[PDB]
Design a binder for this molecule. Structure first.
Ligand SMILES: [Cl-]
Ligand SMILES: [Cl-]
Ligand SMILES: [Cl-]
Ligand SMILES: [Cl-]
Ligand SMILES: [K+]
Ligand SMILES: [Mg+2]
Ligand SMILES: [Mg+2]
Ligand SMILES: [Mg+2]
Ligand SMILES: [Mg+2]
Ligand SMILES: [Mg+2]
Ligand SMILES: [Mg+2]
Ligand SMILES: [Mg+2]
Ligand SMILES: [Mg+2]
Ligand SMILES: [Mg+2]
Ligand SMILES: [Mg+2]
Ligand SMILES: [Mg+2]
Ligand SMILES: [Mg+2]
Ligand SMILES: [Mg+2]
Ligand SMILES: [Mg+2]
Ligand SMILES: [Mg+2]
Ligand SMILES: [Mg+2]
Ligand SMILES: [Mg+2]
Ligand SMILES: [Mg+2]
Ligand SMILES: [Mg+2]
Ligand SMILES: [Mg+2]
Ligand SMILES: [Mg+2]
Ligand SMILES: [Mg+2]
Ligand SMILES: [Mg+2]
Ligand SMILES: [Mg+2]
Ligand SMILES: [Mg+2]
Ligand SMILES: [Mg+2]
Ligand SMILES: [Mg+2]
Ligand SMILES: [Mg+2]
Ligand SMILES: [Mg+2]
Ligand SMILES: [Mg+2]
Ligand SMILES: [Mg+2]
Ligand SMILES: [Mg+2]
Ligand SMILES: [Mg+2]
Ligand SMILES: [Mg+2]
Ligand SMILES: [Mg+2]
Ligand SMILES: [Mg+2]
Ligand SMILES: [Mg+2]
Ligand SMILES: [Mg+2]
Ligand SMILES: [Mg+2]
Ligand SMILES: [Mg+2]
Ligand SMILES: [Mg+2]
Ligand SMILES: [Mg+2]
Ligand SMILES: [Mg+2]
Ligand SMILES: [Mg+2]
Ligand SMILES: [Mg+2]
Ligand code: NA
Ligand code: NA
Ligand code: NA
Ligand code: NA
Ligand code: NA
Ligand code: NA
Ligand code: NA
Ligand code: NA
Ligand code: NA
Ligand code: NA
Ligand code: NA
Ligand code: NA
Ligand code: NA
Ligand code: NA
Ligand code: NA
Ligand code: NA
Ligand code: NA
Ligand code: NA
Ligand code: NA
Ligand code: NA
Ligand code: NA
Ligand code: NA
Ligand SMILES: [Sr+2]
Ligand SMILES: [Sr+2]
Ligand SMILES: [Sr+2]
Ligand SMILES: [Sr+2]
Ligand SMILES: [Sr+2]
Ligand SMILES: [Sr+2]
Ligand SMILES: [Sr+2]
Ligand SMILES: [Sr+2]
Ligand SMILES: [Sr+2]
Ligand SMILES: [Sr+2]
Ligand SMILES: [Sr+2]
Ligand SMILES: [Sr+2]
Ligand SMILES: [Sr+2]
Ligand SMILES: [Sr+2]
Ligand SMILES: [Sr+2]
Ligand SMILES: [Sr+2]
Ligand SMILES: [Sr+2]
Ligand SMILES: [Sr+2]
Ligand SMILES: [Sr+2]
Ligand SMILES: [Sr+2]
Ligand SMILES: [Sr+2]
Ligand SMILES: [Sr+2]
Ligand SMILES: [Sr+2]
Ligand SMILES: [Sr+2]
Ligand SMILES: [Sr+2]
Ligand SMILES: [Sr+2]
Ligand SMILES: [Sr+2]
Ligand SMILES: [Sr+2]
Ligand SMILES: [Sr+2]
Ligand SMILES: [Sr+2]
Ligand SMILES: [Sr+2]
Ligand SMILES: [Sr+2]
Ligand SMILES: [Sr+2]
Ligand SMILES: [Sr+2]
Ligand SMILES: [Sr+2]
Ligand SMILES: [Sr+2]
Ligand SMILES: [Sr+2]
Ligand SMILES: [Sr+2]
Ligand SMILES: [Sr+2]
Ligand SMILES: [Sr+2]
Ligand SMILES: [Sr+2]
Ligand SMILES: [Sr+2]
Length: 237
RNA sequence: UUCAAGGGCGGGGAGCCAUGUGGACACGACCCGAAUCCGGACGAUCUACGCAUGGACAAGAUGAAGCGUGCCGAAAGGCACGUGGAAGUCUGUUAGAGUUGGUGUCCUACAAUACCCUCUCGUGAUCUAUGUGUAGGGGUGAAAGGCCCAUCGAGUCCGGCA
RNA sequence: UGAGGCGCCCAAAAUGAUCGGGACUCAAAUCCACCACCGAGACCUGUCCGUACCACUCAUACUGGUAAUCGAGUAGAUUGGCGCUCUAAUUGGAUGGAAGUAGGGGUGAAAACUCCUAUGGACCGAUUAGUGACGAAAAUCCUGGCCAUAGUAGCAGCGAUAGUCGGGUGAGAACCCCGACGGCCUAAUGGAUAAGGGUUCCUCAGCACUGCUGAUCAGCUGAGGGUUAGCCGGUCCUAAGUCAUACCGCAACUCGACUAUGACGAAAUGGGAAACGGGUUAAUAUUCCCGUGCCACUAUGCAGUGAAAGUUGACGCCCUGGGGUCGAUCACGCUGGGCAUCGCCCAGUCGAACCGUCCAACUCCGUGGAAGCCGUAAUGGCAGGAAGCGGACGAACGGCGGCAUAGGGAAACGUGAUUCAACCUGGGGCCCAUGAAAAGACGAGCAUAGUGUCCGUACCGAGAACCGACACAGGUGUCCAUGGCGGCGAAAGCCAAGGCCUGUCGGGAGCAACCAACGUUAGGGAAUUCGGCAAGUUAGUCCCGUACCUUCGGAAGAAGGGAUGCCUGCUCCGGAACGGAGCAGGUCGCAGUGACUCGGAAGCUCGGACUGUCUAGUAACAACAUAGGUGACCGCAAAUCCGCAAGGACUCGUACGGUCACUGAAUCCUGCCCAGUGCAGGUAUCUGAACACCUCGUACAAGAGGACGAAGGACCUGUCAACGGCGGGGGUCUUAAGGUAGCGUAGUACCUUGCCGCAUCAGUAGCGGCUUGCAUGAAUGGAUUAACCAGAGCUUCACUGUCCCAACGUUGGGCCCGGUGAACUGUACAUUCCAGUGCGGAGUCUGGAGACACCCAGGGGGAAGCGAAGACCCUAUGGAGCUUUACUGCAGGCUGUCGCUGAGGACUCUCACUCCGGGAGGAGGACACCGAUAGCCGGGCAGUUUGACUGGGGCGGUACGCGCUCGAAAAGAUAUCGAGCGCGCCCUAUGGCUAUCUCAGCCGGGGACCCGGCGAAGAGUGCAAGAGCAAAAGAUAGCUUGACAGUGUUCUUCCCAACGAGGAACGCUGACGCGAAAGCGUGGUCUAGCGAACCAAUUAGCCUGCUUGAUGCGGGCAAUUGAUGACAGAAAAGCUACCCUAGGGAUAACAGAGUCGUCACUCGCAAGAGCACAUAUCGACCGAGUGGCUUGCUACCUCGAUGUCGGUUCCCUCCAUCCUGCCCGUGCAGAAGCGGGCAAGGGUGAGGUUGUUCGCCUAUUAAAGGAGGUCGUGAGCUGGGUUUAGACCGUCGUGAGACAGGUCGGCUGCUAUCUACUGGGUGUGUAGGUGUCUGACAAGAACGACCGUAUAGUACGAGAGGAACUACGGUUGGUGGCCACUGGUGUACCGGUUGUUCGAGAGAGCACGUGCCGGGUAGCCA
RNA sequence: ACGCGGUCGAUAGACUCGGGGUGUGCGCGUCGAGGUAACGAGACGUUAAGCCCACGAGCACUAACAGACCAA
């Protein structure tokens, strides 16, 4: 047959690329030698096209102007701190080791100094649980207990823009506008609605996947469609 | 070959070469005749979809939130009028886009997809120009096997090839 | 009373009857005889030829001889010869005329040879031996040329109907130019331009070419000429993004991703230093020239120390205030023009960049001091300081002054105002959407001077300059969006500025038929049709008023009702408008949204929620999307995906994420099932590869085995919003469960037009209800649903030429004339018609009939018309796309192992390697990545296969390998999907021999046993059938292993007649068994019980392996066993309606033809009943026929196409007669029924469901008959149904996909050559003229039918009821004609009136060929 | 193609009547709701008006003239 849509994606042609030339910046934590002698002033609040959430423009002492992944509650004028000796307050960044257990954190690093990888989406937050000299335990938004180097930097507070998902798009047009700001091909034609030549589920008088949808993990691309290595399906049991 | 016997093959000197010709096999194999398959190339001046930079949408209708005034109420609020001007909102041959029916006209055409009337959309998932990207078992596809220069259930060109 | 001969009845078919025809009757018939003739290429006979043979001969050279016993021929075999090219040898011809060509003479059976004459003007032969790109009627053959077609189609159709009269030029003028008159275009038919074109631009001279006719013209031809820039583009910047170099990959590169660097990337339309006005040319022009101005750089001089912070460049969508120019308009003045019943109408009244100046809004400061005020269109503002007052900063492409005794104008050479595009500046709102960058500029003065190069510059920009082969009705971007009336308007309609008469052939006929567009139609009003298709109805605005239902938004402009002009004078809102809303009075018309513009309305049902998407070019939908619902994967060194790799998308992303799927708004809901399949988890035990390890083997190795055992499987569990499933039976069974809520005859229900009801005169429709659901049912989503819809179906009101039933008219064609001028098609012949025949569907054959030639117009019956090597069907050891648990493989994932890889069945470490980090260093770590290999999964991908037979194919079957009987026709052989029926073994005895013996069955004496008799065979003999067998081939007993080894002959397999395996009979040799012996035993009495090569194993001996010896392990001779049943041997599944090719009438579908079981109809016999009574009437059984309407059968015609059903329209026919006419019978009183006879003249109609045919139904009727004509009729119509491509449901299928089920949508080409006919002409014949006739022939339905009255309330009859002859009046259908009457038309005409233009008036144009409305003469019509 | 007339003529047109269609012309005068007036839709009279006719009659005024040819 012909390659399925999932395979066209991989080629990275314009149709499937994100509008990177329109994205602002990558809210990665600042790099400080040591001391925490770094503080900046929130100069403005902006809209981040790549995340549909607000971002805070900050001006640091040493003269560096950079956008930051803002938690909820940060406003113009406010002063933020970044470093080991940073004050324990919303909007400030410091290594987990300095954060007190039971404090909601966001933009958590996976490996000390990487800039932040976890809990960066609207209204989410990781929960710092256990402390130690060898391992900091964090409960990520998915509910998973993650073991991180106490040296991994993070920001206090939850990510700005919470509740974004509570309002329905209501119309295709609204979905449309949002999709135009992401690396995604939309709308979506169902596999069962295509010709046999175009998808494993295509073909047949009436629409239906003439086969079980739960596909094996070992399936090759082009065949791995439907419910990938499902441990179970449905709502029952 | 055979305890044995019986079979098979061969045996009392004619061949070798040349020229013409009959016929066989491989090769194009008396000549033309078709749908393929494969290789390397050339196409996104059409069109599909994306991106960049620009452009277009008379006029009218309806009258959401919000706000106001008055009245009622302890209050929460309610009621009336006004204001306001929302909307993949309505009418609309505005521009522009499209095409339900006539199974009209045409059907060696004006035209290898045209003409007329009727019809639909017309502030948005809108329409449109130019630039730009994606290439052949690959693209692109709100999916019709649609579209990728009058050609697509696998483009075109030349070659494989007689 | 029997028999025979001929005939009669029985006896009905479709265009025109037939024995071939005429026609024949003591025959021209039939039968019995006879007589004489005609009549082939046969037979006889003369001559000749060929061939075979004979004699003679070197001869196949002559000559002679023989043929009663020689003479036809497709495929094919054999042999002699003709012609063409060039070579060679020998030998000739030609300028006293070669070859070729044309016409003609002679020869040869013929291929072909040869001569003559004319032309021609230079080459040409013969013989012999060679050579070969050597012979054409054909291939939908190729190329070129050419005829008919034909002076034919086109040069008309488009909302752009365009001209006419004079004149100019010229050899020539409808279309080249001038004037007048008349028109066309207004987002274009005008102005400026982008792309693209490329000289098309201007001038002169031309008309052979090009131009839909002509041409003096031109985008054509010839020759010249034309594009001028510091300030308009380019050039500069960067955008998406591209390339180059480096680096890396790759076998490699012109290939490839990242990361660096550099460059490239915007001419209308991104950013951007600076130019305006006028004049000038045939053609350029912000470029030249005149006037004025401006920018950048540089130099000089003065000033300046500032200089980089900041600002700008620089930005989305929606609403809106303020400032404000042009334009437009109003008021008044000036200048000029127009008009002339008035006094109006038109134009102009100008003047730039630039320099200077003014500043509203926003922001801010001072003052002030609000506790309720300030302000807006709106939001809003304020003790964190409102209003007010003052101030800083600060706008226009704007105002004002200069510019300007510049320019421009014939002149005047204005002034105010309103509405205000441009442009300037603010306020508000929206985002799960956030609306470029860079160069540059400002910041940062002035004088003077110098420099400012390079490239583009014409023209078109489109119904003739671009693309579409064209001077193509198509396509093609930008700006002019503010010209006047109009009105809501960038709408219509009319008119300016400007453009044009080139959406380029004309002339003529009251101008016929017919067609395209269109106007008007009395009465009826959807009767038309599948369907109101088409057309129409409604319509603008204001007032009143508005239902069910609803998601409370909506439904809604629901519906329904009323008003609407003009004139006079006013009121209200507003600053005002040349803005809006009303009032009073007057008044005209048929009509006041007067034209134009401008909704028909309502209800029920199905589907999809909605806007949106789609098959460029037959599908716009119910299909796709969608928000919403749901499930799955993944913590980021992730999941998913691309790349061979280097690397990459997702991703400037991080679970409120984004990937993979399903369902498809809201609302109420979403049951049961984990057995199979899928996925996932677990797993004692079982199973599970390679490496390493161990044993055997080998001096080594191959190899055999063992131990260990990863993923995987077995096994267990979870999971259905995972594939899917929810039956049959009984009051459980398969296979897990056994269908819950709902809905239900459905777009799912075959039965089926289900049943009831509604509605209609009548309703296969539709709606409601019931519902056992052939075969509904819950995210394969169920139900339901307001709103929405060019979606499917139904009903109503209104309206109407859809119809009854057609008419008249309008414009363009059509017809005639000038000019221009194709194509399709053509084996030939061709004036046909009726029948027949024929490969059964003939203009050409046969028989008749008819037929004087040619031409014009027509509508299309036929040429199975033209156009396409049938799309349907089958066939091919064809193709392709698609599917899967088909065959075989390939990627990919998982997993073990080896290398990378290090130190001290579980562990630590660090040093390789990986990752994070700017770095230090941190994390990880011998793992991971990567290289190699092994096991599992693996339609993601590739190549293939998927057989044959067959009354076409599929399904079914196997007549696909064997045996018997019959078919089989008395030797042998012999077919069909022919009839009956078997074999794929079984048996160590059920084999072999010998001895002894005789069996079924029946009878007699004491179903077991014993005795006797009869008993040729009916028993038994393994199994089909047919056959064989009695001191046996059977039985019993005993013994035995010949069911043995080797090797043949012959027959069979395969008649004849070649072919393997297999089989049989018969031998020889060896060794045996039994018997006295002869002899018997090569399995079972005979005919079924079977298998190649390659490979393996096995048996016994021997041969052999690369210099040589030994050992291992191989190779071979002979044979046994292991299977291919598609059985003389491939390893092997499907779909295609997305399809494709080659062919087939070798093979199906429609139709034809044959048949006639079926069907229709008839006849014979007449049981039976009809109260009695065969025969008034009904009529079983059985028997005999006719037809060719039904169905079946066949495969004869046709696959290089003969278009389907139904309907429609139009014509002819048949009779087996429904009515009408005339009759007979009656269980006939009458009236009326019932049955029958002659008879085809005429008639046989309108409607409801349904595509329907048929049929069911309704009201009428004299009756509302049936059938044939290719189931007449698509070069006539329709397109509802059938029958492609899209889609849905049910059922089936794992799936692709299917269904002889349902359902929505879905394209109909052509200019007529011949023939045929309807009408119209010209000629010839009879044979200068006029007028009048005749009548062979030919056509008719010219007439058919009904009602009523008198007869008559009579005859008849108890009564009830109730005729006829005949004479009348009328209706209906058909027919021919006519217009006084009624009606229609009537773009003659007259009138009314809306918008606009001509100033008003008068009088007119346009609004489609009448703007609209009213009336209507002639004529034509019903 | 056919039919009629051609001066021995009414064949066609002009003109005039007749017969028809429409519906009361231009202009002027009076009136006219009003309005100081200007002005004024419309009404009445003149007006069986005006305009028009594919028909008929009369009428040689114009045109059927002039004239060419064939023919037993
Ligand atoms: Cl989303
Ligand atoms: Cl010869
Ligand atoms: Cl330019
Ligand atoms: Cl404002
Ligand atoms: K055929
Ligand atoms: Mg970031
Ligand atoms: Mg996008
Ligand atoms: Mg979808
Ligand atoms: Mg599809
Ligand atoms: Mg597939
Ligand atoms: Mg393009
Ligand atoms: Mg309002
Ligand atoms: Mg004779
Ligand atoms: Mg010689
Ligand atoms: Mg030749
Ligand atoms: Mg031939
Ligand atoms: Mg013709
Ligand atoms: Mg033209
Ligand atoms: Mg009518
Ligand atoms: Mg009907
Ligand atoms: Mg319609
Ligand atoms: Mg006022
Ligand atoms: Mg339905
Ligand atoms: Mg829809
Ligand atoms: Mg289409
Ligand atoms: Mg549509
Ligand atoms: Mg669905
Ligand atoms: Mg369920
Ligand atoms: Mg489904
Ligand atoms: Mg035909
Ligand atoms: Mg064919
Ligand atoms: Mg194939
Ligand atoms: Mg395949
Ligand atoms: Mg025999
Ligand atoms: Mg084999
Ligand atoms: Mg063996
Ligand atoms: Mg065989
Ligand atoms: Mg084909
Ligand atoms: Mg045949
Ligand atoms: Mg046949
Ligand atoms: Mg009869
Ligand atoms: Mg009677
Ligand atoms: Mg008749
Ligand atoms: Mg019939
Ligand atoms: Mg037919
Ligand atoms: Mg026909
Ligand atoms: Mg047709
Ligand atoms: Mg035709
Ligand atoms: Mg239908
Ligand atoms: Mg399909
Ligand atoms: Na192939
Ligand atoms: Na393109
Ligand atoms: Na249409
Ligand atoms: Na391809
Ligand atoms: Na041809
Ligand atoms: Na012309
Ligand atoms: Na819409
Ligand atoms: Na299961
Ligand atoms: Na079901
Ligand atoms: Na729609
Ligand atoms: Na009509
Ligand atoms: Na015809
Ligand atoms: Na295919
Ligand atoms: Na096969
Ligand atoms: Na069968
Ligand atoms: Na044999
Ligand atoms: Na018969
Ligand atoms: Na028909
Ligand atoms: Na009759
Ligand atoms: Na036919
Ligand atoms: Na047709
Ligand atoms: Na038909
Ligand atoms: Sr990052
Ligand atoms: Sr980083
Ligand atoms: Sr499917
Ligand atoms: Sr459940
Ligand atoms: Sr493009
Ligand atoms: Sr809309
Ligand atoms: Sr609209
Ligand atoms: Sr249609
Ligand atoms: Sr029409
Ligand atoms: Sr067409
Ligand atoms: Sr194409
Ligand atoms: Sr080739
Ligand atoms: Sr012969
Ligand atoms: Sr012969
Ligand atoms: Sr014309
Ligand atoms: Sr046309
Ligand atoms: Sr000439
Ligand atoms: Sr550049
Ligand atoms: Sr304004
Ligand atoms: Sr055009
Ligand atoms: Sr003009
Ligand atoms: Sr012309
Ligand atoms: Sr009329
Ligand atoms: Sr109807
Ligand atoms: Sr369409
Ligand atoms: Sr729902
Ligand atoms: Sr399971
Ligand atoms: Sr039930
Ligand atoms: Sr014709
Ligand atoms: Sr059949
Ligand atoms: Sr025997
Ligand atoms: Sr199957
Ligand atoms: Sr289909
Ligand atoms: Sr008869
Ligand atoms: Sr009768
Ligand atoms: Sr029926
Ligand atoms: Sr039929
Ligand atoms: Sr018929
Ligand atoms: Sr149809
Ligand atoms: Sr003659
Ligand atoms: Sr009586
Ligand atoms: Sr007109």
């Amino acid at each position: 047959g012909r390659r399925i849509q999932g395979q066209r994606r991989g080629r990275g042609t314009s149709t499937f690329r994100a509008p990177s030339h329109r994205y602002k910046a990558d809210l990665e934590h600042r790099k400080v030698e040591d001391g925490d002698v770094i503080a900046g002033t929130v100069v403005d609040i902006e809209h981040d096209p790549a995340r549909s959430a607000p971002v805070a423009a900050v001006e640091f002492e040493d003269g560096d102007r950079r956008l930051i992944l803002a938690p909820e509650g940060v406003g113009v004028g406010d002063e933020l701190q970044v470093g080991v000796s940073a004050e324990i307050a919303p909007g400030n960044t410091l290594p987990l080791a300095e954060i007190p257990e039971g404090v909601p954190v966001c933009n958590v690093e996976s490996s000390p100094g990487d800039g932040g990888k976890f809990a960066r989406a609207s209204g989410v937050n990781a929960q710092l649980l256990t402390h130690d000299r060898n391992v900091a335990v964090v409960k990520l938004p998915s509910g998973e207990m993650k073991r991180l180097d106490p040296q991994c930097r993070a920001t206090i507070g939850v990510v700005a823009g919470g509740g974004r998902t509570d309002k329905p798009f209501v119309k295709a047009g609204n979905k449309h506008h949002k999709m135009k700001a992401r690396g995604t091909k939309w709308p979506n034609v169902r596999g069962v609605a295509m010709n046999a030549v175009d998808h494993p589920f295509g073909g047949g008088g009436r629409q239906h996947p003439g086969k079980p949808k739960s596909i094996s993990r070992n399936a090759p691309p082009g065949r791995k469609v439907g419910d990938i290595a499902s441990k179970r399906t449905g709502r029952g049991g």
